[PDB]
């Protein structure tokens, strides 16, 4: 055939993992990748729903599209089959994030060196932007209502494995792991989780203040 289906499959997989799951992967993505992905979606009849969704945002990029329950189910099935990750939560927030990101990209002009913009954009519910204190108080009110679940009172010292071999084997198994990769993954993961929760919360985040000041505080207190 005239289409490298495998390579376009790989490109679409990478881009969707980059935008939707927002996995730790972070590399430069060029117009080639988006073109390949759109062609891949258009080619597959199964993915015509996703293709139509992406196309719709070209004109108006400021709204969640209206669908039916069956349409949503089929869309979830198509996305799950594409990603080949049934063991994940991709219910609705994933789709909204993807629509927002593609709305930004398609309605963005050409740039020489990236844009590097946070995915805090085009939130839903059309709610006025809310403050941390207001939402925190409102939600804590619900939290403080009732319903604990376990009553551990006396308190036993935190157990520790006394066998050294059980520790030396673990050290041997875990040693080859590079520490930098682990730290980078964990940090990026916390960042993305906070970003998604905040975006759904429909509030105004601190781009380079709250997490940044937290890091600064840790470094200063440990150092000086």
């Amino acid at each position: 055939e005239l289409i490298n289906m495998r390579r376009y499959r790989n490109a679409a997989r990478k881009l969707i993992h980059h935008y939707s799951l927002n996995s730790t992967s972070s590399t430069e993505y060029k117009i080639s990748d988006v073109v390949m992905t759109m062609i891949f979606l258009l080619r597959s009849e199964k993915y015509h729903s996703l293709f139509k969704l992406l196309e719709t945002t070209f004109d108006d990029y400021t709204c969640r599209p209206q669908m039916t329950q069956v349409q949503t189910d089929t869309l979830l099935d198509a996305v799950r089959s594409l990603l080949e990750m049934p063991s994940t939560t991709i219910d609705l927030t994933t789709v909204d994030i993807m629509r927002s990101s593609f709305a930004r990209c398609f309605n963005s002009p050409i740039m020489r060196y990236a844009k590097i913009v946070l995915l805090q954009n085009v939130a839903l519910q059309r709610d006025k932007r809310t403050t941390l204190e207001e939402l925190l108080i409102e939600r804590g009110e619900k939290i403080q209502m009732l319903q604990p679940q376990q009553y551990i009172n006396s308190g036993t010292e935190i157990p520790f494995c006394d066998d050294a071999e059980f520790l030396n084997r673990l050290l041997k198994h875990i040693d080859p792991y590079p520490l930098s990769r682990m730290y980078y993954n964990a940090a990026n993961t916390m960042f993305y989780t906070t970003m998604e929760n905040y975006a759904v919360s429909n509030c105004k985040f601190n781009i380079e203040d709250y997490n940044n000041i937290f890091k600064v505080m840790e470094n200063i207190r440990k150092h000086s």
Partner: protein, 346 residues
């Protein structure tokens, strides 16, 4: 492997000892009986179980250890018309043919003899030796390479420990094992036994035995219900036992399988023990009436297209049922729903 046309092969379980009565002189075109008889054996050890006085017909007897030769191909064996030749449990390609007939009495049927002629002496009502492991008895070890020494003990004693020197090549180990197994199958009562070898080698030996019995069956030998059991199946049996079987029965595998044989028929389905005991090669069972087992199948095969799955295979139905069960149970994940699709025919 293309056997020469002068070879005659007799195979029987009771050939672990030399069959003196069956050895007779052969006549070539010279039409003169040849009395110089020459015999071959696997190892020098077997020489100590061949009487020179058990051949009244023959004038002179010469014994040799059958040592493999390379200068002579099996396609055109060397001919020595000056002496009759009779082999015994050969383990390498035969290379020497006596005048006229050349019988080969063996208890093992390798590939080298497969394409030769054959006269199997099948067996009636074999006993199945019992395999177990100690983890309370006086274990009686046996020299596997020379079982003929301990014939009286094998007849009388009950527990036995297969023991092999590291010298023995794989073929000789196989031959000794087959000897001892035939001895057991001829025993008056089942005998317990174990092997003092690493498990992988035991599996290799049992694969060899299974293929040997397959060749025997393909030459018309009567089937034997006694056979070895795969180690993975043994682990599954041990897990089932630990789950519910308290003691260590002698034939606990047979116990499980018959304990489910009691139910195979009336409910019309395979007991899952059999399924796990076994890609494709799907097993079934029968009754005198026409009906299969796994789906209650007809005697032909899996039907090609019996009825549509529109109401089930659609993603909407499976999703609705999944959401219903998840909401009712309070789960968030860990539950999988599959449509009832394996419906051959009711």
């Amino acid at each position: 492997m293309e056997c020469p046309f002068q070879i005659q092969v007799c195979i029987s379980d009771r050939f672990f000892a030399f069959p003196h009565n069956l050895v007779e002189p052969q006549s070539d075109v010279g039409n003169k009986l040849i009395e110089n008889l020459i015999v071959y054996v696997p190892t020098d050890d077997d020489r100590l179980y061949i009487d020179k006085k058990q051949f009244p017909k023959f004038n002179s007897v010469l014994v040799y250890r059958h040592e493999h030769d390379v200068n002579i191909d099996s396609r055109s064996p060397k001919k020595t018309a000056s002496a009759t030749i009779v082999y015994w449990n050969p383990l390498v390609p035969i290379t020497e043919i006596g005048a006229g007939e050349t019988r080969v009495f063996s208890v093992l049927l390798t590939n080298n003899l497969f394409y030769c002629n054959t006269m199997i002496v099948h067996h009636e009502n074999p006993k199945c030796p019992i395999e177990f492991t100690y983890p309370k008895s006086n274990l009686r070890p046996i020299a596997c390479e020379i079982p003929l020494s301990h014939f009286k003990e094998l007849v009388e004693s009950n527990d036995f420990l297969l023991c092999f020197n590291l010298e023995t090549s794989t073929m000789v180990k196989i031959l000794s094992l087959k000897r001892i197994f035939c001895i057991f199958q001829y025993r008056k009562q089942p005998a317990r036994y174990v092997i003092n070898l690493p498990h992988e080698e035991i599996d290799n030996l049992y694969n060899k035995l299974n293929w040997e019995r397959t060749r025997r069956l393909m030459k018309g030998d009567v089937p034997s219900n006694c056979a070895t059991v795969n180690r993975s199946s043994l682990k599954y049996i041990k897990q089932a036992q630990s789950l519910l079987g308290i003691p260590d029965y002698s034939q606990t595998v047979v116990d499980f399988v018959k304990m489910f044989q009691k139910i195979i028929f009336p409910y019309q389905l395979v007991p899952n023990v059999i399924i796990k005991l076994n890609l494709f090669c799907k097993n079934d069972s029968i009754a005198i009436s026409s009906s299969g087992i796994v789906p209650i199948n007809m005697p032909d095969f899996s039907p090609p297209n019996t009825f549509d799955y529109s109401d089930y295979a659609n993603r909407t139905n499976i999703n609705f049922v999944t959401q219903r069960v998840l909401t009712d149970g309070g789960f968030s994940s860990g539950i999988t729903v599959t449509p009832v699709k394996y419906n051959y025919y009711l």
